[PDB]
Amino acid sequence: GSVHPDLRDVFSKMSFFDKIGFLFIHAFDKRNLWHKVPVPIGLLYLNTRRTLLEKYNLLAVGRSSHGALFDPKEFLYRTEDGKYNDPHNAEAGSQNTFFGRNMEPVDQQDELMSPDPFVVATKLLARREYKDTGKQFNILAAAWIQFMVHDWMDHMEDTGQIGITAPKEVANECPLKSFKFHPTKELPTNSDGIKIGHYNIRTAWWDGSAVYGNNEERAEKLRTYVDGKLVIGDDGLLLHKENGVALSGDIRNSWAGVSILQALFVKEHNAVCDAIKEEHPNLSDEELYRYAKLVTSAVIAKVHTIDWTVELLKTKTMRAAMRANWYGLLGKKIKDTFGHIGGPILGGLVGLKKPNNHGVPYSLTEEFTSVYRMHSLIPSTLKLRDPTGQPDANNSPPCLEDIDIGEMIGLKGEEQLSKIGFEKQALSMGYQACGALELWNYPSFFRNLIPQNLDGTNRSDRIDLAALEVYRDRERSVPRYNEFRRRLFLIPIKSWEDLTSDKDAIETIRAIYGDDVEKLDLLVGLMAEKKIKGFAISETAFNIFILMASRRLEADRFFTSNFNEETYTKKGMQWVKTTEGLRDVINRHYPEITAKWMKSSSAFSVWDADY
Ligand code: HEM
Ligand SMILES: CCCCCCCCCCO[C@@H]1O[C@H](CO)[C@@H](O[C@H]2O[C@H](CO)[C@@H](O)[C@H](O)[C@H]2O)[C@H](O)[C@H]1O
Ligand SMILES: [Ca+2]
Ligand SMILES: [Cl-]
Ligand SMILES: [Cl-]
Ligand SMILES: [Cl-]
Ligand SMILES: [Cl-]
Ligand code: NA
Ligand code: NA
Incomplete structure (x- = not known):
């Protein structure tokens, strides 16, 4: 049999053109070869796989016939709420809209607690021997991805609470014996296909909302209202409200590392304002803000x-x-x-x-x-x-x-950062590897974490984040690891040995999941999966990236139709065109530590990396 049995049904229904693309990618996949061939073939493989995913793995949630009519030429800037981007759909990518799906949901309402999230957290996730990335990826890189992710996506919560309790078998090993949390809000779609969806309370567009804000109350309070600029402290750190919450784009559940990146990009935005004003002396505060937001979001x-x-x-x-x-x-x-x-x-x-x-x-x-x-x-x-x-x-x-990173998290973390300063914090993060995405590497401070409200204030109910994450994937009907792979046209595992060569991992997985490969939680699988040489992430996760990272550029009017000098200004466009990485941004505002200590080409490498 040519095609894997689990993919024969979908193959049989494919158009001739899709059959060709699938057979091409599947030929490599059956032999684990795509990443082992020269670049040109690898690229052909990736484009072919991407085309297939674009056809089979983009599912609407909610009614697509969004009528709201508008002229794109009336909105030549990135709106605060993310509306008015897609000329055919005023609502697309705006805040308070449904998350779409890449796969049909898998109802897990009868298995939300199977196996127990605390057991999974304790036995499979909890950090044992610390694992890092060597020189590949530093703490600035870890801060960067939160600076992105906590900004891109945040699920609307139900106002009510539920609670889960650690079972007898693992309680003595759990930092928390039980915890309360808000269920993900379920909203009816009132549509033909998927019946239930969840809301993203952030914008989906690349619009720099981590710096510009989510909401009409800080979005305003972040601006100086002079020369298009944003508010920043005299130490180059974010300012803070009396309640201790940072004056930036409403990133909840943050830490000091994210805060310095927000601060850096506030200075970037302000410097863009200076450069555009110099070219166009007569622009208003609002005009400068709009152009600089376009520039900074693209940077x-x-x-x-x-x-x-x-x-x-x-x-x-x-x-x-x-x-x-x-x-x-x-x-x-x-x-x-x-x-x-x-x-x-x-x-x-x-x-x-x-x-x-x-x-x-x-x-x-x-x-x-x-x-x-x-x-x-x-x-x-x-x-x-x-x-x-x-x-x-x-x-x-x-x-x-040495400082415990737990002391650098949340509101108390903002306090510690105010005593450390930008240069020391940034340099320190640059010179240290971040953690590896493997089993048994989940930080202990996440297992009794104070979570935050939307406004950034502390909730009284601590959480075991590792236990909660496993619960969230099930609650939200995301297919488990093996089915997840199948839906992305990837070959499923037959046994644990297909997942990883780590004997300890296999034995521990077997103790919890048995030999039922369909039971393996997505998060566990993504962490345990044997990695491609050079890849910090699993191939499974990467497949969602192939599709979605491309989509976030290609679907955006301001990276396509309106990616021009007329929309950004000439100086604004030059600013984007001449900025190649984080190194360039850090060098602009902190050339001294850059020249003295940043030896690696990328500011995301551990800074003494030899490349
Ligand atoms: C010390 C830093 C961090 C803290 C304190 C933190 C904490 C949290 C908390 C409390 C939640 C919400 C859990 C829930 O109620 O469901 C969350 C969600 C999330 N975090 Fe983090 N996190 C940190 C770093 C990171 C990093 C480095 C990433 C990597 C990209 C990340 C990715 C995510 C994702 C994807 C979600 C789910 C968002 C959603 O459900 O819409 N976080 N985090
Ligand atoms: C360079 C010159 C190009 C030559 C012309 C190429 C024309 C082929 C394009 C469409 O290919 C067909 O697509 C159908 C689906 O759209 C397939 O039906 C399959 O899938 C359908 C539904 O998915 C099922 O109803 C059918 O029974 C099942 O045969 C069918 O097999 C396949 O050949
Ligand atoms: Ca955004
Ligand atoms: Cl082309
Ligand atoms: Cl991405
Ligand atoms: Cl460019
Ligand atoms: Cl190039
Ligand atoms: Na394998
Ligand atoms: Na170089």
């Missing part, structure tokens, strides 16, 4: 695309793939000199003549949330280093003290 997307993701997926094929999405396969030189040439492959997703949503209204999806659950990236302790110290024996800035 953030660009840094994520061709710097962050490139270090996350540290292979030649992936450097080429991500750069192709942004610049096109014809490359930066041609793109910058002549503009977008050809279609999405040759010229890239950025600069396409028109946005393309592939027939399905733009949204972030339930599965995009699940594959971005990367809490194990946070190390247990931070080595604080001296920005003007004598180089140590390793030629690093010398260590001053």
Whole structure:
């Protein structure tokens, strides 16, 4: 049998053209080969797999016939609530809208607690021997992805509470013996297909909302209302309200590492304001704000695309793939000199003549949330280093003290940061590897964590985040690991040995799940899955990225139809075109620590990396 038995049914229903693409990708997959071939073939594989996913793995949630009529030329800026982007759909990507799906839901209402979330958290997730990424990915990279993810997606909660209790078998090992939390809000779609959906309370667009705000009350209170600028402290750190909450884009459940990135991008936005005002002296505060928001949001997307993701997926094929999405396969030189040439492959997703949503209204999806659950990236302790110290024996800035990262989280974390300062915090994060996405690497401070309200204030009910994450994936009807793979046209595991070569992992998984591979939780599978050389993430998670990372550029009017000098200003567009990574942004505002200590090409590498 040519095709895997579990994929024969879908194969039989494919069009001739899809059959060809599927057989091509499946030929590599059966032999685990896509990542083991030269770049050009790897890219052909990825584009072919992407096309298939775009056809089979974009599902609308809620009615797609959103009528609300408007002229795109009336909205040549990124709106505060994310409305008025898609010319055919005023609601697409705005706050308080349904998460879409990449796969048909799997009802787990009778198995929400099977196996027990505390057991999973305690036996499979809880950090044992600490594992890091070596030189590949530092703590700035861990902060970056939260700065992205806690901004991109936040599920609307039910006002009521439920609680779960640690079972006898693991209670003595649980930092919390029970905890309360709010269920995810279920809302009827009133539609033909999927009946129930959940709401994203953030915008789905690349719009820098981590810095610009979610809401009409801080979105305003973040602005100086002079020269388009945003509010920042004299130490280069965020200002704070009397209740201790940071004055930035309403990122709840944050830590000091995210706060310094918000602060850095506030300065970036303000510097963009200065540059545009110099070119166009007569612009109002509102005009400058709008242009600078366009510029800064694009800088953030660009840094994520061709710097962050490139270090996350540290292979030649992936450097080429991500750069192709942004610049096109014809490359930066041609793109910058002549503009977008050809279609999405040759010229890239950025600069396409028109946005393309592939027939399905733009949204972030339930599965995009699940594959971005990367809490194990946070190390247990931070080595604080001296920005003007004598180089140590390793030629690093010398260590001053170890700090428990638990002390750097949330409101108390904002306090500690105000005593540390930007340079020390940033340098220290730059010189330390982040945690690896593997089993037994989930920080203890997450297992008795104070969660926050929407307004950023502390809730009185601590949570075991690891237990809750496992619960959330089930609660939200996201398929479990093996079915999740099948739905992405990936070969399922037959036994635990297919998942990982770690004997201890196998034995521990067997003790909890038995030999039922269909029971394995998604999060557990994503962490345990044997990794591609250079990949910080599982191949399973990567498959959602293939689809969704492309989509977030291609579906956006401001990265396509309106990615031009007229919309951004000439100086604004040049600012985007000449910024290649986080290094460039840090260098703009902190050239001193950059010159002295940032030796690696990417600011996301541990800063003494030899490349
Ligand atoms: C110390 C830093 C962090 C803290 C304190 C923290 C805490 C939290 C909390 C309390 C939640 C909500 C749990 C719930 O009610 O369902 C959450 C959600 C989430 N976090 Fe984190 N987190 C941190 C870092 C990260 C990192 C590094 C990532 C990696 C991208 C990440 C990704 C996510 C995702 C995908 C969700 C689910 C969002 C949703 O349900 O819409 N977080 N986090
Ligand atoms: C370069 C020159 C190009 C030559 C022309 C190519 C034309 C082929 C395009 C469509 O291919 C067909 O698509 C059908 C589906 O759209 C398939 O039906 C399959 O799937 C259907 C539904 O998914 C089922 O109802 C059918 O029974 C089942 O045969 C069918 O097999 C397949 O051949
Ligand atoms: Ca946003
Ligand atoms: Cl290039
Ligand atoms: Cl093309
Ligand atoms: Cl992404
Ligand atoms: Cl560019
Ligand atoms: Na395998
Ligand atoms: Na270099």
